[PDB]
Design a protein around this ligand. Structure first.
Ligand SMILES: CC(=O)N[C@H]1[C@H]([C@H](O)[C@H](O)CO)O[C@@](O[C@H](CO)[C@@H](O)[C@@H]2O[C@@](O)(C(=O)O)C[C@H](O)[C@H]2NC(C)=O)(C(=O)O)C[C@@H]1O
Lengths: 666, 666, 666
């Protein structure tokens, strides 16, 4: 029988057990770790961990079901190349946000900075939202983002411009916007007499001039409904400009009212930082305090490599002021994409290793926001993955994913161009012991690497904590080829299965749950993206406004009454001009034409008609105007050219002309 | 070690066990109840119940995973405010129906009485269907319904008319419709000679004159296909009007045939009941027998409050005749929304308590349909929730939900305007012991209350039994703010995340299951709402008819051949008139125009053209008519005004005029 | 206590156990089989099998949860009648294919041969794809397919033509197409001097002249991008015509490059086989080798019945050449739809039994591709189901489904026209033991048969192995009536809930899994079928091109700039002609008209206008042309008829006519 001490070879014991029990029996390993020389049938165990040396000298750990309290979710399912949550995730007012980039490749082509959000602690996720448009100068350049977070109720993002041609960095800008919230407040509004401004006391409001604010039950005349911030007095007070003045001071103290903000109705604040010298990518976001934050960065295009952070001490008053700070220079070679987080006055930083045959990922802490560091090397050249993390109690909990199967270990060659099942790990490291020598990387879930192209969307994720769960948001593929090598070298997302990469989220229990289960099985018709309702007439009805930007083929079409108390049906045409034309008929091009009719049918019996004949028509380019009255209003009836065409013809005479004077023949 | 006797404090023993076992180990409580002073990590237990007194003197019970055989499902996911299944659910011919109201708020604004249904015992649910239109007098008033059910194969519903302004009741009507069914029959059709009618024997058909009936393989000439009920002879017999008569008698005795009904092609019968005096809400539905049913009601607008039911003895012959029956007067204060159900000659009624500081929910039974009652009070002022229920064996099984977290208990203050996790409970009550003093409310799932507005959509549900499962259908929110206090005071469902309230269903096993599992994991593309198919050309194709009522923006559009043996493409315009117009160009307003062409391109080479120039065009309001023929048919070519406009001009002369007589100059 | 020896009656033991244990306790049967005279509460057991004789003398087995490592998925959800995966499933380059027919009934009406695919080992499935169009002579005949598979990287299908009227077979054709692949290759391309063809060495390419091939990084001038196969030299070599030639030879030996294939951009090869004599249905597919394959068939319309296969020895060079081979004549009566598979030089065939009261399904094997056979009979007249299977180790693993509940057993009468829960079974048979006398059929999942019509979509499935799982793809229904006997005798899929039959897949573990779990919960918005993204303006945006073929009702419509550098908005009309017309208005028909306008509003102020008045208008069939110029280009302005209409009128006089010559009057 098995020792389960994590050192004694249990292979043979475990094999005997499996052969001796029925396949349906969940063998309970009692939370112990069993050393093996080959992985057994993991699916037959619960509450079991395995230590296994795929590559001798590099032990890795493997969790059976129920070893950790955890679950994998698939959180996007879109034809875009969906990847790079790195390192933008955050939670705000109970909502979990998973930003990423949806593109058509490793690059900024067709790219939108996007997010999906969860309102239910990760069970269920929202329809993707585009945060950025394509750049004005597309397709020369487009946006890109790997650093996003929240500081004092505003979203802050380092929005980069990069070339489509080489993904070369061109511009860095700090964009920020207030987050949408509802506040239920008591007092705080004052309006002095004989002037129109009211001042609002909202602690750490994070609003700027022109940002949206809406008011309910204020009890101060004029402070009502949709308004904008007129001035900001300080971090806790601002004013709105009302439409009226009164001859007595108002003051809503003691009264319960409501505000009022909106991400979507407030403009971005965009602060151009130019081409920050010596930067390849800005990556990760660490809220420091009420005034500012840090974003990570590295430079890896030319020697020497840099890895560090930019600290923005006061991003509210001075968004363009930041200070660069570098990790110790011995950890900078072969490093990139640092993840940074800030906890009780300590800033933690973990690097990506670029190579399996060089010193890889390292960990650093500072008590002065990067001026001085204490540092530590992860054993065995951890590489190709970022290591996003959170601190829970004394532990840094970090997650990582090899990009393709069997690439994790030191000295493991890249292995692309064939379908595989890359491993995802997490590890705990205690900040007090500050030693990585014995870190245990635990394989908790396996993803798919498609193999159709060299690049992989798997991993390169982001981590947040909400209440007693930690969430690792990361990319994963499926086996559907994008056909880059095939009929889709243009990388059109909307051909066939589009791009295989989508987002997943591993949700792990991190503390006690003192509540009954909130989990449900989803059995609903998903009805947010294209809300469909069967009308009383039994026909599918979509009440949401929508944009179709791809080419549309329609069958029979009815334009219903919709405009001006529904007196009319309306089609409006945009652009410089609109064109309504007629294809060449496939079977009978000799009939080519459009009939315009003021009545319900093709018979002129039903209403006035004008019929435009195609060039292919038997009656080439003929026009027939058919009504019971032809009335020409507001201008003369004239030929385009001079002394070129006539009124009537020998076989089409008008009976006469009713004139107010004799013709002017000239 | 823990005693698990439901009285001895097991907190310390349970804590010791938790610390001493691995986190992945499911701790088995052996179906026992453990008293605690704080809830432990419930997620680590299986088959375990906790008794806990959050509020001293008020024990509630808490189920670990697997203590009951039950599972929560989410059954809608719609931007509408989806709530109030109360109390309308029913099962009919294997389909579970979950009616509700989808609106934009606690009120009748934008509201459609709706339902979703399950065809697979609750695993999977249908696209929402609207059962009512917006009221003809919208937006002054609109429909509302909390009472619906099935009697003798017809749906019966109390459709209320209520004002948008104050949700004041305005009108009560009984609407009913036959349910859709397929009948596989033998005999029952007779056709007497020399007349065009046929009589159909169908026991308890429940149809009315004008209702839809379809026939197959009748073997009675003329009784075939789509038809309607011409007269109803009695509950078991009706006639249809065929297109022909025979000179000998017809009688399909001994022959197997099929009928034939439809909810959708039969009109509602609407019986106007007026403004039923002394009624606030009609709520719940209890089928009594083959001829009628009772609906619950309450009056809570003015003293004295009333709580009771309306019995409709014969809803088929006399839909407008009903009798009011009230519960005992002592139970009527602080009570509303009674749930009513009828079993083996006993009518059961459970009230909603309106406040936590007053005697709450009570249960009543009657052997004479509400003339006399036996009554009992639930301990500790059960409030804010309806208590829909079913009788299984000797037990009433009831479900309830607090509307926000920690509101359930007696004396618990309302706690709104902050996000929380409201508890949902069920309880068993033995009808022979008829005593609620020791009722055990068991917390079986937790919901979310969003907190962005005072109102909550959680709970207020409905209950049905199908085979050996009971189902509780009720509302629940998520963390997505509606932004009522924000950019969406107008409460528009299709802005941002719409309204967070949606429907869930708790499915609980209630008797033995003598079959292998029917459960599946859903892995399909949901393809009912907007059925999409990749055509052979690789383009997504929707074959279903559809209505888009919200503003549409389209890109490139082709109108394909579709009408009159596909000889033509067709666009029909509705309303009093149609308008096809041209927006003001953004970049080059001087170009504003629409080109109408009988050919395929902008070049007039491809076909006849009419070009309408906008007022902003360099050639302001010009029209250019361009054809190789301009032929004016059916009427004179005239100026709109008299002696105002000319034919030609000095720089635009017609070569001549071909006339059949000299001009008439006058 | 229970013996669990599979022969001793354990009913009372088991009953006492259930009575003495809490309902939440999963009772472990330790992989043992328990004989019962009634099925107990299966839901309360884990790792337990039951032997039970519903029909005395006919033992069947019943699996509790966790007895097998297996799970059911639902893989289609479509209003079409989705059924008959029989017997077309296959795996190709890590993708699982589940082809089927989506129709409106048991017949070829509205039918499209279709498939859904899995990219993740069966967790998740794709949007349905149509493989065939409606037949050109629809609705007289249409397509049908029950045999499909892969041989040497081509898809091969027997596409049948059958009448809508009687489902009678009319034509058989072999359709084939190359499968899409990405190949990552080293060397193999040579291009001889002074000619333009590059020959490509790709072993077993399976391509034909005209098939699509795409090249990247070839390092051979001209061999680049999208190309087509010019000639095929042999099975390992083909050429592409390059744009150019060189004076010296080229050979990329040692250079890495990529190809390049496409199912969608390559035409079908269609080989007409005529109406193959004495065939009712071609069914099932067995790849024999690199050159060809076998397809099963049966003839069941006239005596004598035939069951066998058609062997196509070289489908590449001679698609039209096949040889008929039949199973031994004693096994032909009452048999149909053979499933065939080929393993290690042995061809296996299992038949469908057509009735429960005659010798049923039989198994056969041959080492000469059907010339001689060794045969065996399944006990108890197995009938109404095909038995698709795979060989894993020494075992044939087969699956079958009764079509409605309790039809499986010998002598069991069909039981249609009532909703039921039909049993699905699997069985193992060792080919070295070659005796079915003690076959154990294990009920592993229960489906639903709707009952609204006699026909059943359940079962008639298909089986594949991928890695260490076996997959059974089959049909199953739900409780939603199609209303064939009701308001939808026309069987329109898009009314109400359409057709209840859809596809499911049972995924069963068949070998050890040496990896951590790949499973996830699906929490995304399904966004492949109609990809929706909230744009930066907060509106749902669909960027994919789409076709709507069903009648569309639209509200307010804006045609946005789309065409020719987005200078213009564009609507093109197809067919022989386009029609734009105006419905009869409901409220004010006397207003019937369309206003066409070159500007933004209904006021003529905004642009030139032409208004067509309906016949219903007060000004019946009036046209009003309103611009500040009316210019008639390219042609004379003429009346349609000769000397019938005038220019002007007594109350609508032109001021004069500007002419280059006097009127020509006649
Ligand atoms: C499920 C369905 O679509 N049932 C329809 C059937 C069905 O098409 C046929 O029974 C064949 O399967 O037909 C029904 O109408 C039939 C049409 O065949 C009848 O109207 C008969 O049509 C005749 O033309 C004929 O010869 O068949 C004349 C005959 O007298 C008709 N029978 C009667 C009773 O009038 C049907 O009623 O069976 C309609 C049904 O929805």
């Amino acid at each position: 029988s098995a020792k389960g001490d994590g050192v004694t070879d249990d292979t043979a014991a475990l094999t005997s057990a499996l052969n001796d029990t029925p396949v349906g029996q969940k063998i309970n390993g009692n939370g112990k770790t069993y050393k093996v020389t080959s992985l057994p049938d993991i699916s037959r165990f619960i509450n079991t961990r395995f230590v296994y040396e795929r590559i001798p000298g590099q032990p890795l750990y493997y969790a059976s079901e129920e070893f950790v309290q955890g679950e994998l979710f698939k959180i996007t399912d879109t034809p875009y190349y969906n990847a790079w949550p790195q390192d933008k995730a955050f939670v705000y007012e109970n909502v979990i946000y998973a930003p990423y980039m949806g593109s058509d490749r490793h690059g900024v082509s067709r790219l939108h900075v996007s997010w999906v959000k969860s309102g239910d602690d990760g069970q269920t996720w929202s329809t993707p939202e585009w945060l950025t448009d394509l750049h004005p100068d597309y397709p020369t350049v487009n946006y890109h983002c790997m650093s996003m977070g929240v500081c004092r109720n505003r979203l802050f993002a380092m929005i980069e411009t990069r070339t489509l041609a080489k993904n070369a960095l061109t511009n860095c800008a700090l964009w920020d916007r207030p987050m949408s919230r509802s506040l239920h407040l008591t007092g705080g509004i004052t309006k002095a007499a004989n002037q129109r401004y009211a001042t609002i006391h909202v602690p750490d409001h994070g609003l700027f001039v022109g940002d949206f604010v809406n008011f309910s039950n204020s009890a101060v005349t004029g402070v009502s409904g949709d308004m904008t911030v007129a001035t900001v007095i300080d971090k806790d007070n601002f004013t709105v400009l009302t439409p009226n003045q009164q001859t007595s001071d108002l003051n809503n103290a003691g009264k319960n009212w409501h505000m009022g903000t909106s991400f979507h109705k407030s403009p971005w604040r965009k602060t151009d930082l130019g081409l920050i010298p010596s930067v390849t990518e800005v990556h990760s976001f660490a809220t420091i305090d009420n005034n500012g934050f840090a974003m990570g960065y590295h430079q890896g295009d030319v020697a020497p490599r840099e890895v560090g952070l930019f600290y923005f001490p006061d991003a509210f008053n001075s968004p363009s002021n930041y200070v660069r700070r570098q990790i110790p220079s011995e950890y900078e070679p072969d490093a990139s994409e640092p993840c940074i987080k800030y906890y009780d006055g300590v800033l933690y930083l973990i690097t990506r290793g670029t190579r399996g045959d060089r010193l890889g990922s390292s960990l650093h802490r500072s008590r002065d926001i990067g001026q001085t560091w204490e540092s530590l090397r992860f054993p065995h050249n951890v590489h190709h993955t970022t290591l996003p993390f959170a601190k829970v109690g004394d532990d840094l909990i970090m997650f990582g994913s090899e990009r393709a199967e069997n690439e994790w270990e030191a000295g493991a060659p890249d292995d692309r161009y064939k379908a595989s099942y890359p491993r995802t790990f997490y590890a705990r490291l205690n900040v007090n012991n500050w030693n990585a020598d014995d870190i245990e990387w635990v394989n908790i879930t396996d993803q798919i690497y498609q193999g159709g192209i060299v690049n992989s969307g798997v991993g390169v994720g982001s981590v947040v904590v909400k209440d007693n769960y930690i969430y690792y948001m990361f990319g994963g593929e499926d086996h559907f080829n994008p056909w880059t090598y095939g009929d889709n070298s243009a990388k059109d997302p909307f051909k066939s299965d589009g791009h295989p990469s989508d987002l997943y989220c591993y949700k792990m229990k991190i503390g006690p749950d003192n509540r009954v289960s909130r989990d449900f099985r989803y059995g609903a018709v998903p009805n947010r993206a294209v809300p469909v309702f069967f009308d009383t007439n039994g026909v599918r009805t979509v009440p949401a406004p929508m944009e179709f930007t791809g080419d549309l083929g329609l069958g029979h079409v009815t334009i219903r009454a919709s405009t001006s108390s529904n007196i009319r049906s309306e089609v409006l045409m945009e652009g410089e001009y609109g064109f309504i034309g007629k294809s060449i008929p496939t079977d009978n091009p000799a009939g080519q034409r459009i009939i315009f009719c003021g009545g319900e049918g093709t018979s002129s019996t039903t209403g006035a008609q004008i019929t435009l004949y195609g060039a292919n028509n038997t009656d080439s380019r003929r026009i027939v105007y058919n009504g019971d009255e032809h009335l020409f209003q507001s201008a003369d009836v004239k030929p385009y050219n001079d002394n070129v065409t006539a009124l009537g013809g020998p076989s089409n005479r008008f009976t006469t002309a009713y004139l107010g004077s004799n013709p002017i023949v000239t």
